[PDB]
């Protein structure tokens, strides 16, 4: 089996037991460091009518090293690229062992709520987001309907 740090196990369990509102995370049976994640597109945002899928993996040196996350659902966002990759401070310079999975996912949800074209990951998207903001909001709302699972 190859044991799991008391940290992970406690976090895994509490994610189900004390789940983050609008978010789910559970491990792959064959890899308990690998998580299936869904995040509800914030209410009032351009992604409100959808549920987005992400995957996450805890590296060995976690929590010293931040966990790995990326979107599986195709999404229109200045800070998320064509492969689901995310550019968020907590996942990088601002990672800290005080932080945890739930904080990160919370943060990714927060990122959907308030975009930031000024420090983009997908410049083509970012440009549309600066040049024509409301129109981008529309492309995002459309893409949500096209690629995200509809919120029941």
């Amino acid at each position: 089996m190859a044991s799991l740090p008391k940290r992970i196990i406690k976090e895994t369990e509490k994610l189900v037991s004390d789940p983050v509102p609008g978010i789910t995370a559970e491990p792959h049976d064959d890899n308990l460091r690998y998580f299936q994640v869904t995040i509800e597109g914030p209410e009032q945002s351009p992604y409100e009518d959808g549920i987005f899928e992400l995957e996450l993996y805890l590296p060995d040196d976690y929590p010293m090293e931040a966990p790995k996350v990326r979107f599986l659902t195709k999404i229109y966002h200045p800070n998320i690229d064509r492969l689901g990759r995310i550019s968020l401070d907590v996942l990088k310079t601002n990672w800290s062992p005080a932080l945890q999975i739930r904080t990160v996912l919370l943060s990714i949800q927060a990122l959907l709520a308030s975009p930031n074209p000024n420090d983009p990951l997908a410049n083509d998207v970012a440009e549309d987001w600066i040049k024509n903001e409301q129109g981008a909001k529309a492309k995002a709302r459309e893409w949500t309907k096209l690629y995200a699972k509809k919120k029941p």
Partner: protein, 135 residues
């Protein structure tokens, strides 16, 4: 125990930020396959040879069991090496990097090890189509 997807994302970074020798390049064949199964590669001909001065475009298939299982390579650009099928372009599974393959191997090590067989450990300049001749 690093999931296939993240191993691939790891190599994608190095490939897109060029963190590797200038003799090789690799990346996604297209930005639509979220599974990152199809990859394209390049190897510029070794200096002083028929290879000298030419870009070899290859196809790398990273299957669902990558990197536990080696990937499938195939020369797109017409070329003439031994380990590669004279008609299809596939690099035979017997090639030392393919067989022997270990999780620790990468598309980077693969292309390099493949570029070594070039300049042919000898002079074997065979004779190349070069040009826009493609398999």
């Amino acid at each position: 125990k690093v999931p296939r997807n993240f191993r691939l994302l790891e190599e994608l970074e190095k490939g897109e930020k060029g963190f590797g020798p200038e003799s090789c390049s690799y990346g996604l064949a297209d930005s639509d396959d979220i599974t990152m199964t199809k990859w394209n590669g390049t190897i510029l001909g070794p200096p002083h040879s028929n290879h000298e001065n030419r870009i070899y475009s290859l196809s790398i298939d990273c299957g669902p069991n990558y990197p536990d299982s080696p990937p499938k390579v195939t020369f797109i650009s017409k070329i003439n090496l031994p380990c590669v099928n004279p008609t299809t372009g596939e690099v035979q599974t017997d090639f030392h990097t393919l067989r022997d393959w270990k999780r620790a191997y990468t598309m980077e090590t693969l292309l390099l090890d493949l570029r070594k067989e070039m300049a042919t450990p000898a002079n074997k300049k065979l004779r190349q189509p070069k040009e826009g001749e493609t398999f």
